[PDB]
PDB file of all heavy atoms in Angstrom:
ATOM      1  N   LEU A   1       0.809  -1.211   0.000  1.00 49.87           N
ATOM      2  CA  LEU A   1       0.000   0.000   0.000  1.00 49.87           C
ATOM      3  C   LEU A   1       0.845   1.265   0.000  1.00 49.87           C
ATOM      4  O   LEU A   1       0.360   2.321  -0.419  1.00 49.87           O
ATOM      5  CB  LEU A   1      -0.931  -0.007   1.212  1.00 49.87           C
ATOM      6  CG  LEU A   1      -2.210   0.819   1.123  1.00 49.87           C
ATOM      7  CD1 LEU A   1      -3.102   0.292   0.014  1.00 49.87           C
ATOM      8  CD2 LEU A   1      -2.939   0.796   2.455  1.00 49.87           C
ATOM      9  N   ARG A   2       2.094   1.184   0.463  1.00 51.02           N
ATOM     10  CA  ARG A   2       2.939   2.368   0.562  1.00 51.02           C
ATOM     11  C   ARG A   2       3.352   2.914  -0.798  1.00 51.02           C
ATOM     12  O   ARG A   2       3.776   4.071  -0.883  1.00 51.02           O
ATOM     13  CB  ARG A   2       4.181   2.050   1.395  1.00 51.02           C
ATOM     14  CG  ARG A   2       4.849   3.268   2.009  1.00 51.02           C
ATOM     15  CD  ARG A   2       6.349   3.067   2.145  1.00 51.02           C
ATOM     16  NE  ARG A   2       7.013   4.250   2.680  1.00 51.02           N
ATOM     17  CZ  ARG A   2       7.213   5.373   2.002  1.00 51.02           C
ATOM     18  NH1 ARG A   2       6.826   5.499   0.743  1.00 51.02           N
ATOM     19  NH2 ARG A   2       7.819   6.393   2.602  1.00 51.02           N
ATOM     20  N   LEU A   3       3.238   2.119  -1.861  1.00 52.12           N
ATOM     21  CA  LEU A   3       3.613   2.551  -3.200  1.00 52.12           C
ATOM     22  C   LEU A   3       2.471   3.237  -3.940  1.00 52.12           C
ATOM     23  O   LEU A   3       2.476   3.268  -5.177  1.00 52.12           O
ATOM     24  CB  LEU A   3       4.128   1.362  -4.015  1.00 52.12           C
ATOM     25  CG  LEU A   3       5.360   0.644  -3.461  1.00 52.12           C
ATOM     26  CD1 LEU A   3       5.972  -0.260  -4.517  1.00 52.12           C
ATOM     27  CD2 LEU A   3       6.384   1.643  -2.949  1.00 52.12           C
ATOM     28  N   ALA A   4       1.491   3.773  -3.215  1.00 52.77           N
ATOM     29  CA  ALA A   4       0.380   4.466  -3.865  1.00 52.77           C
ATOM     30  C   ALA A   4       0.822   5.679  -4.674  1.00 52.77           C
ATOM     31  O   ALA A   4       0.411   5.792  -5.844  1.00 52.77           O
ATOM     32  CB  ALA A   4      -0.672   4.842  -2.817  1.00 52.77           C
ATOM     33  N   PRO A   5       1.622   6.619  -4.141  1.00 52.77           N
ATOM     34  CA  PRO A   5       2.038   7.757  -4.979  1.00 52.77           C
ATOM     35  C   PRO A   5       2.792   7.333  -6.225  1.00 52.77           C
ATOM     36  O   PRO A   5       2.564   7.893  -7.309  1.00 52.77           O
ATOM     37  CB  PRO A   5       2.917   8.586  -4.031  1.00 52.77           C
ATOM     38  CG  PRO A   5       3.376   7.622  -3.000  1.00 52.77           C
ATOM     39  CD  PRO A   5       2.216   6.705  -2.794  1.00 52.77           C
ATOM     40  N   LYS A   6       3.667   6.331  -6.096  1.00 53.40           N
ATOM     41  CA  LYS A   6       4.408   5.820  -7.241  1.00 53.40           C
ATOM     42  C   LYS A   6       3.462   5.424  -8.364  1.00 53.40           C
ATOM     43  O   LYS A   6       3.574   5.914  -9.491  1.00 53.40           O
ATOM     44  CB  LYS A   6       5.257   4.620  -6.814  1.00 53.40           C
ATOM     45  CG  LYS A   6       6.447   4.325  -7.715  1.00 53.40           C
ATOM     46  CD  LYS A   6       7.349   5.530  -7.888  1.00 53.40           C
ATOM     47  CE  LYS A   6       7.951   5.950  -6.559  1.00 53.40           C
ATOM     48  NZ  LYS A   6       8.791   7.164  -6.704  1.00 53.40           N
ATOM     49  N   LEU A   7       2.484   4.574  -8.053  1.00 53.83           N
ATOM     50  CA  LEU A   7       1.559   4.108  -9.078  1.00 53.83           C
ATOM     51  C   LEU A   7       0.733   5.257  -9.641  1.00 53.83           C
ATOM     52  O   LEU A   7       0.627   5.417 -10.863  1.00 53.83           O
ATOM     53  CB  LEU A   7       0.651   3.020  -8.509  1.00 53.83           C
ATOM     54  CG  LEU A   7       1.324   1.693  -8.166  1.00 53.83           C
ATOM     55  CD1 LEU A   7       0.356   0.792  -7.418  1.00 53.83           C
ATOM     56  CD2 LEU A   7       1.836   1.012  -9.425  1.00 53.83           C
ATOM     57  N   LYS A   8       0.159   6.087  -8.763  1.00 50.61           N
ATOM     58  CA  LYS A   8      -0.804   7.076  -9.237  1.00 50.61           C
ATOM     59  C   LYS A   8      -0.138   8.114 -10.135  1.00 50.61           C
ATOM     60  O   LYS A   8      -0.617   8.376 -11.246  1.00 50.61           O
ATOM     61  CB  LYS A   8      -1.531   7.739  -8.062  1.00 50.61           C
ATOM     62  CG  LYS A   8      -0.663   8.491  -7.081  1.00 50.61           C
ATOM     63  CD  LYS A   8      -1.369   8.655  -5.747  1.00 50.61           C
ATOM     64  CE  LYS A   8      -2.389   9.776  -5.802  1.00 50.61           C
ATOM     65  NZ  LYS A   8      -1.735  11.111  -5.747  1.00 50.61           N
ATOM     66  N   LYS A   9       0.985   8.694  -9.704  1.00 48.44           N
ATOM     67  CA  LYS A   9       1.630   9.702 -10.533  1.00 48.44           C
ATOM     68  C   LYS A   9       2.811   9.141 -11.319  1.00 48.44           C
ATOM     69  O   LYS A   9       3.690   9.902 -11.739  1.00 48.44           O
ATOM     70  CB  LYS A   9       2.029  10.922  -9.698  1.00 48.44           C
ATOM     71  CG  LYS A   9       3.057  10.722  -8.612  1.00 48.44           C
ATOM     72  CD  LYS A   9       3.813  12.025  -8.419  1.00 48.44           C
ATOM     73  CE  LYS A   9       4.691  12.003  -7.188  1.00 48.44           C
ATOM     74  NZ  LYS A   9       5.714  13.083  -7.236  1.00 48.44           N
ATOM     75  N   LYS A  10       2.845   7.825 -11.526  1.00 47.09           N
ATOM     76  CA  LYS A  10       3.557   7.249 -12.655  1.00 47.09           C
ATOM     77  C   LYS A  10       2.605   6.945 -13.802  1.00 47.09           C
ATOM     78  O   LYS A  10       2.964   7.122 -14.971  1.00 47.09           O
ATOM     79  CB  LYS A  10       4.287   5.974 -12.227  1.00 47.09           C
ATOM     80  CG  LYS A  10       5.270   5.442 -13.256  1.00 47.09           C
ATOM     81  CD  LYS A  10       6.033   4.247 -12.710  1.00 47.09           C
ATOM     82  CE  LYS A  10       5.467   2.941 -13.244  1.00 47.09           C
ATOM     83  NZ  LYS A  10       6.289   1.769 -12.835  1.00 47.09           N
ATOM     84  N   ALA A  11       1.386   6.493 -13.486  1.00 48.65           N
ATOM     85  CA  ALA A  11       0.366   6.355 -14.518  1.00 48.65           C
ATOM     86  C   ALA A  11      -0.124   7.713 -14.998  1.00 48.65           C
ATOM     87  O   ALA A  11      -0.491   7.857 -16.171  1.00 48.65           O
ATOM     88  CB  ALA A  11      -0.804   5.521 -13.998  1.00 48.65           C
ATOM     89  N   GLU A  12      -0.145   8.713 -14.111  1.00 52.49           N
ATOM     90  CA  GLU A  12      -0.486  10.067 -14.537  1.00 52.49           C
ATOM     91  C   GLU A  12       0.507  10.580 -15.572  1.00 52.49           C
ATOM     92  O   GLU A  12       0.113  11.197 -16.569  1.00 52.49           O
ATOM     93  CB  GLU A  12      -0.531  10.999 -13.325  1.00 52.49           C
ATOM     94  CG  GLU A  12      -0.263  12.459 -13.651  1.00 52.49           C
ATOM     95  CD  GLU A  12      -0.293  13.345 -12.423  1.00 52.49           C
ATOM     96  OE1 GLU A  12      -1.391  13.803 -12.042  1.00 52.49           O
ATOM     97  OE2 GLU A  12       0.783  13.585 -11.835  1.00 52.49           O
ATOM     98  N   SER A  13       1.799  10.326 -15.357  1.00 48.80           N
ATOM     99  CA  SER A  13       2.811  10.727 -16.325  1.00 48.80           C
ATOM    100  C   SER A  13       2.718   9.936 -17.622  1.00 48.80           C
ATOM    101  O   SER A  13       3.277  10.365 -18.636  1.00 48.80           O
ATOM    102  CB  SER A  13       4.207  10.572 -15.722  1.00 48.80           C
ATOM    103  OG  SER A  13       4.515   9.207 -15.504  1.00 48.80           O
ATOM    104  N   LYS A  14       2.032   8.793 -17.613  1.00 48.06           N
ATOM    105  CA  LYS A  14       1.875   7.993 -18.820  1.00 48.06           C
ATOM    106  C   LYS A  14       0.684   8.427 -19.662  1.00 48.06           C
ATOM    107  O   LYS A  14       0.712   8.264 -20.888  1.00 48.06           O
ATOM    108  CB  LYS A  14       1.736   6.512 -18.455  1.00 48.06           C
ATOM    109  CG  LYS A  14       1.946   5.564 -19.624  1.00 48.06           C
ATOM    110  CD  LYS A  14       2.122   4.131 -19.149  1.00 48.06           C
ATOM    111  CE  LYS A  14       3.183   4.036 -18.063  1.00 48.06           C
ATOM    112  NZ  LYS A  14       4.483   4.616 -18.501  1.00 48.06           N
ATOM    113  N   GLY A  15      -0.356   8.976 -19.040  1.00 46.51           N
ATOM    114  CA  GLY A  15      -1.510   9.452 -19.776  1.00 46.51           C
ATOM    115  C   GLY A  15      -2.776   8.663 -19.509  1.00 46.51           C
ATOM    116  O   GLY A  15      -3.864   9.237 -19.420  1.00 46.51           O
ATOM    117  N   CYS A  16      -2.644   7.344 -19.381  1.00 48.45           N
ATOM    118  CA  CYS A  16      -3.794   6.498 -19.126  1.00 48.45           C
ATOM    119  C   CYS A  16      -4.310   6.736 -17.706  1.00 48.45           C
ATOM    120  O   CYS A  16      -3.561   7.193 -16.838  1.00 48.45           O
ATOM    121  CB  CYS A  16      -3.420   5.033 -19.354  1.00 48.45           C
ATOM    122  SG  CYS A  16      -2.529   4.214 -18.021  1.00 48.45           S
ATOM    123  N   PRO A  17      -5.588   6.452 -17.446  1.00 47.89           N
ATOM    124  CA  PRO A  17      -6.190   6.897 -16.192  1.00 47.89           C
ATOM    125  C   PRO A  17      -5.487   6.282 -14.998  1.00 47.89           C
ATOM    126  O   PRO A  17      -5.012   5.132 -15.053  1.00 47.89           O
ATOM    127  CB  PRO A  17      -7.643   6.417 -16.307  1.00 47.89           C
ATOM    128  CG  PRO A  17      -7.584   5.254 -17.209  1.00 47.89           C
ATOM    129  CD  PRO A  17      -6.498   5.569 -18.201  1.00 47.89           C
ATOM    130  N   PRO A  18      -5.398   7.016 -13.892  1.00 47.03           N
ATOM    131  CA  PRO A  18      -4.571   6.584 -12.762  1.00 47.03           C
ATOM    132  C   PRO A  18      -5.167   5.377 -12.064  1.00 47.03           C
ATOM    133  O   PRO A  18      -6.375   5.116 -12.170  1.00 47.03           O
ATOM    134  CB  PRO A  18      -4.565   7.813 -11.836  1.00 47.03           C
ATOM    135  CG  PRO A  18      -5.111   8.946 -12.661  1.00 47.03           C
ATOM    136  CD  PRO A  18      -6.036   8.317 -13.643  1.00 47.03           C
ATOM    137  N   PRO A  19      -4.350   4.614 -11.342  1.00 48.51           N
ATOM    138  CA  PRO A  19      -4.879   3.490 -10.565  1.00 48.51           C
ATOM    139  C   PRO A  19      -5.724   3.977  -9.399  1.00 48.51           C
ATOM    140  O   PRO A  19      -5.573   5.097  -8.907  1.00 48.51           O
ATOM    141  CB  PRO A  19      -3.616   2.777 -10.073  1.00 48.51           C
ATOM    142  CG  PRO A  19      -2.585   3.845 -10.025  1.00 48.51           C
ATOM    143  CD  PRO A  19      -2.895   4.768 -11.170  1.00 48.51           C
ATOM    144  N   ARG A  20      -6.626   3.108  -8.955  1.00 48.84           N
ATOM    145  CA  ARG A  20      -7.548   3.423  -7.872  1.00 48.84           C
ATOM    146  C   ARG A  20      -7.030   2.810  -6.579  1.00 48.84           C
ATOM    147  O   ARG A  20      -6.809   1.595  -6.504  1.00 48.84           O
ATOM    148  CB  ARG A  20      -8.959   2.924  -8.186  1.00 48.84           C
ATOM    149  CG  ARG A  20      -9.040   1.475  -8.636  1.00 48.84           C
ATOM    150  CD  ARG A  20     -10.266   0.795  -8.048  1.00 48.84           C
ATOM    151  NE  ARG A  20     -10.175   0.659  -6.598  1.00 48.84           N
ATOM    152  CZ  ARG A  20     -11.194   0.340  -5.812  1.00 48.84           C
ATOM    153  NH1 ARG A  20     -12.401   0.111  -6.302  1.00 48.84           N
ATOM    154  NH2 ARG A  20     -10.996   0.250  -4.500  1.00 48.84           N
ATOM    155  N   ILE A  21      -6.821   3.651  -5.576  1.00 45.91           N
ATOM    156  CA  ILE A  21      -6.432   3.162  -4.248  1.00 45.91           C
ATOM    157  C   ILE A  21      -7.616   2.435  -3.623  1.00 45.91           C
ATOM    158  O   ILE A  21      -8.769   2.861  -3.823  1.00 45.91           O
ATOM    159  CB  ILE A  21      -5.969   4.330  -3.372  1.00 45.91           C
ATOM    160  CG1 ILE A  21      -4.843   5.099  -4.068  1.00 45.91           C
ATOM    161  CG2 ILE A  21      -5.509   3.849  -2.004  1.00 45.91           C
ATOM    162  CD1 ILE A  21      -3.746   4.212  -4.618  1.00 45.91           C
ATOM    163  N   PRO A  22      -7.403   1.338  -2.897  1.00 45.16           N
ATOM    164  CA  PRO A  22      -8.528   0.673  -2.229  1.00 45.16           C
ATOM    165  C   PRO A  22      -9.259   1.626  -1.294  1.00 45.16           C
ATOM    166  O   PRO A  22      -8.645   2.424  -0.582  1.00 45.16           O
ATOM    167  CB  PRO A  22      -7.863  -0.476  -1.458  1.00 45.16           C
ATOM    168  CG  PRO A  22      -6.377  -0.272  -1.604  1.00 45.16           C
ATOM    169  CD  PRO A  22      -6.179   0.525  -2.843  1.00 45.16           C
ATOM    170  N   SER A  23     -10.585   1.533  -1.308  1.00 43.72           N
ATOM    171  CA  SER A  23     -11.415   2.446  -0.543  1.00 43.72           C
ATOM    172  C   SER A  23     -11.239   2.204   0.956  1.00 43.72           C
ATOM    173  O   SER A  23     -10.976   1.080   1.385  1.00 43.72           O
ATOM    174  CB  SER A  23     -12.881   2.277  -0.929  1.00 43.72           C
ATOM    175  OG  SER A  23     -13.692   3.274  -0.334  1.00 43.72           O
ATOM    176  N   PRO A  24     -11.368   3.250   1.775  1.00 43.29           N
ATOM    177  CA  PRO A  24     -11.317   3.044   3.231  1.00 43.29           C
ATOM    178  C   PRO A  24     -12.471   2.218   3.764  1.00 43.29           C
ATOM    179  O   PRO A  24     -12.398   1.750   4.906  1.00 43.29           O
ATOM    180  CB  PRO A  24     -11.344   4.474   3.791  1.00 43.29           C
ATOM    181  CG  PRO A  24     -11.936   5.302   2.701  1.00 43.29           C
ATOM    182  CD  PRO A  24     -11.479   4.674   1.422  1.00 43.29           C
ATOM    183  N   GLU A  25     -13.537   2.031   2.980  1.00 42.12           N
ATOM    184  CA  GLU A  25     -14.698   1.289   3.461  1.00 42.12           C
ATOM    185  C   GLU A  25     -14.347  -0.158   3.788  1.00 42.12           C
ATOM    186  O   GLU A  25     -14.786  -0.689   4.814  1.00 42.12           O
ATOM    187  CB  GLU A  25     -15.822   1.346   2.428  1.00 42.12           C
ATOM    188  CG  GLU A  25     -16.754   2.537   2.585  1.00 42.12           C
ATOM    189  CD  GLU A  25     -16.191   3.807   1.979  1.00 42.12           C
ATOM    190  OE1 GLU A  25     -15.094   3.749   1.383  1.00 42.12           O
ATOM    191  OE2 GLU A  25     -16.844   4.864   2.098  1.00 42.12           O
ATOM    192  N   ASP A  26     -13.566  -0.815   2.934  1.00 43.38           N
ATOM    193  CA  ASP A  26     -13.185  -2.201   3.169  1.00 43.38           C
ATOM    194  C   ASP A  26     -11.822  -2.340   3.832  1.00 43.38           C
ATOM    195  O   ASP A  26     -11.351  -3.467   4.016  1.00 43.38           O
ATOM    196  CB  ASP A  26     -13.213  -2.996   1.857  1.00 43.38           C
ATOM    197  CG  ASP A  26     -12.131  -2.571   0.881  1.00 43.38           C
ATOM    198  OD1 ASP A  26     -11.514  -1.509   1.081  1.00 43.38           O
ATOM    199  OD2 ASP A  26     -11.894  -3.313  -0.095  1.00 43.38           O
ATOM    200  N   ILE A  27     -11.174  -1.228   4.187  1.00 43.12           N
ATOM    201  CA  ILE A  27      -9.907  -1.308   4.908  1.00 43.12           C
ATOM    202  C   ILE A  27     -10.117  -1.932   6.281  1.00 43.12           C
ATOM    203  O   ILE A  27      -9.367  -2.819   6.702  1.00 43.12           O
ATOM    204  CB  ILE A  27      -9.256   0.083   5.012  1.00 43.12           C
ATOM    205  CG1 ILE A  27      -8.719   0.515   3.647  1.00 43.12           C
ATOM    206  CG2 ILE A  27      -8.152   0.083   6.056  1.00 43.12           C
ATOM    207  CD1 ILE A  27      -7.660  -0.412   3.094  1.00 43.12           C
ATOM    208  N   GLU A  28     -11.152  -1.485   6.997  1.00 43.68           N
ATOM    209  CA  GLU A  28     -11.458  -2.101   8.281  1.00 43.68           C
ATOM    210  C   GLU A  28     -12.017  -3.506   8.118  1.00 43.68           C
ATOM    211  O   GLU A  28     -11.984  -4.282   9.076  1.00 43.68           O
ATOM    212  CB  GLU A  28     -12.441  -1.241   9.079  1.00 43.68           C
ATOM    213  CG  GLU A  28     -13.883  -1.310   8.609  1.00 43.68           C
ATOM    214  CD  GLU A  28     -14.265  -0.132   7.738  1.00 43.68           C
ATOM    215  OE1 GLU A  28     -13.352   0.516   7.187  1.00 43.68           O
ATOM    216  OE2 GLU A  28     -15.475   0.149   7.609  1.00 43.68           O
ATOM    217  N   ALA A  29     -12.525  -3.849   6.932  1.00 47.24           N
ATOM    218  CA  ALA A  29     -13.043  -5.195   6.711  1.00 47.24           C
ATOM    219  C   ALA A  29     -11.942  -6.238   6.852  1.00 47.24           C
ATOM    220  O   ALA A  29     -12.164  -7.313   7.421  1.00 47.24           O
ATOM    221  CB  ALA A  29     -13.702  -5.288   5.335  1.00 47.24           C
ATOM    222  N   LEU A  30     -10.750  -5.940   6.334  1.00 47.01           N
ATOM    223  CA  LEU A  30      -9.639  -6.882   6.436  1.00 47.01           C
ATOM    224  C   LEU A  30      -9.225  -7.093   7.887  1.00 47.01           C
ATOM    225  O   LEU A  30      -9.049  -8.234   8.334  1.00 47.01           O
ATOM    226  CB  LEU A  30      -8.459  -6.382   5.606  1.00 47.01           C
ATOM    227  CG  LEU A  30      -7.221  -7.278   5.581  1.00 47.01           C
ATOM    228  CD1 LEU A  30      -7.377  -8.373   4.542  1.00 47.01           C
ATOM    229  CD2 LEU A  30      -5.973  -6.453   5.309  1.00 47.01           C
ATOM    230  N   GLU A  31      -9.069  -6.005   8.641  1.00 46.37           N
ATOM    231  CA  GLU A  31      -8.587  -6.107  10.011  1.00 46.37           C
ATOM    232  C   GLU A  31      -9.644  -6.629  10.975  1.00 46.37           C
ATOM    233  O   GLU A  31      -9.288  -7.223  11.998  1.00 46.37           O
ATOM    234  CB  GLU A  31      -8.072  -4.747  10.492  1.00 46.37           C
ATOM    235  CG  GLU A  31      -9.135  -3.671  10.581  1.00 46.37           C
ATOM    236  CD  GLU A  31      -8.554  -2.300  10.862  1.00 46.37           C
ATOM    237  OE1 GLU A  31      -7.312  -2.175  10.905  1.00 46.37           O
ATOM    238  OE2 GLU A  31      -9.341  -1.348  11.050  1.00 46.37           O
ATOM    239  N   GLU A  32     -10.930  -6.432  10.678  1.00 49.89           N
ATOM    240  CA  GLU A  32     -11.986  -6.948  11.536  1.00 49.89           C
ATOM    241  C   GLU A  32     -12.243  -8.433  11.325  1.00 49.89           C
ATOM    242  O   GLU A  32     -12.952  -9.041  12.132  1.00 49.89           O
ATOM    243  CB  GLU A  32     -13.280  -6.158  11.312  1.00 49.89           C
ATOM    244  CG  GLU A  32     -13.306  -4.795  11.994  1.00 49.89           C
ATOM    245  CD  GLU A  32     -12.811  -4.843  13.427  1.00 49.89           C
ATOM    246  OE1 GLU A  32     -13.304  -5.690  14.200  1.00 49.89           O
ATOM    247  OE2 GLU A  32     -11.925  -4.036  13.780  1.00 49.89           O
ATOM    248  N   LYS A  33     -11.695  -9.028  10.268  1.00 50.37           N
ATOM    249  CA  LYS A  33     -11.781 -10.467  10.066  1.00 50.37           C
ATOM    250  C   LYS A  33     -10.481 -11.186  10.380  1.00 50.37           C
ATOM    251  O   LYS A  33     -10.510 -12.298  10.908  1.00 50.37           O
ATOM    252  CB  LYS A  33     -12.220 -10.786   8.626  1.00 50.37           C
ATOM    253  CG  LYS A  33     -11.255 -10.369   7.520  1.00 50.37           C
ATOM    254  CD  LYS A  33     -10.261 -11.479   7.198  1.00 50.37           C
ATOM    255  CE  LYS A  33      -9.363 -11.122   6.035  1.00 50.37           C
ATOM    256  NZ  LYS A  33      -8.391 -12.214   5.761  1.00 50.37           N
ATOM    257  N   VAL A  34      -9.332 -10.573  10.080  1.00 47.81           N
ATOM    258  CA  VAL A  34      -8.057 -11.243  10.305  1.00 47.81           C
ATOM    259  C   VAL A  34      -7.740 -11.361  11.789  1.00 47.81           C
ATOM    260  O   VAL A  34      -6.893 -12.174  12.178  1.00 47.81           O
ATOM    261  CB  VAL A  34      -6.934 -10.500   9.555  1.00 47.81           C
ATOM    262  CG1 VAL A  34      -6.552  -9.218  10.287  1.00 47.81           C
ATOM    263  CG2 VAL A  34      -5.728 -11.407   9.335  1.00 47.81           C
ATOM    264  N   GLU A  35      -8.410 -10.575  12.634  1.00 43.14           N
ATOM    265  CA  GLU A  35      -8.127 -10.604  14.064  1.00 43.14           C
ATOM    266  C   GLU A  35      -8.467 -11.956  14.678  1.00 43.14           C
ATOM    267  O   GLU A  35      -7.752 -12.440  15.564  1.00 43.14           O
ATOM    268  CB  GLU A  35      -8.887  -9.482  14.771  1.00 43.14           C
ATOM    269  CG  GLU A  35      -8.544  -9.334  16.244  1.00 43.14           C
ATOM    270  CD  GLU A  35      -9.241  -8.153  16.883  1.00 43.14           C
ATOM    271  OE1 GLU A  35      -9.950  -7.419  16.163  1.00 43.14           O
ATOM    272  OE2 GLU A  35      -9.114  -7.981  18.114  1.00 43.14           O
TER     273      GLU A  35
END
């Protein structure tokens, strides 16, 4: 997840639409089940 700026403004420099960061809605979904 730490490579978000790399992906977003490397695809921005390419022209094609930027990648989508995972939504915060399901971020707690992972941690509320893996516990």
Side-chain angles (χ1 to χ4, degrees):
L1 204 63
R2 202 211 178 287
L3 300 195
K6 202 55 63 182
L7 292 171
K8 61 201 281 284
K9 64 151 170 163
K10 191 175 101 174
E12 154 181 274
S13 67
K14 196 167 309 305
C16 80
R20 50 141 293 167
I21 305 312
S23 188
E25 271 81 3
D26 68 347
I27 288 299
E28 76 261 20
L30 181 83
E31 64 188 4
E32 282 315 309
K33 64 90 176 179
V34 76
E35 186 176 357

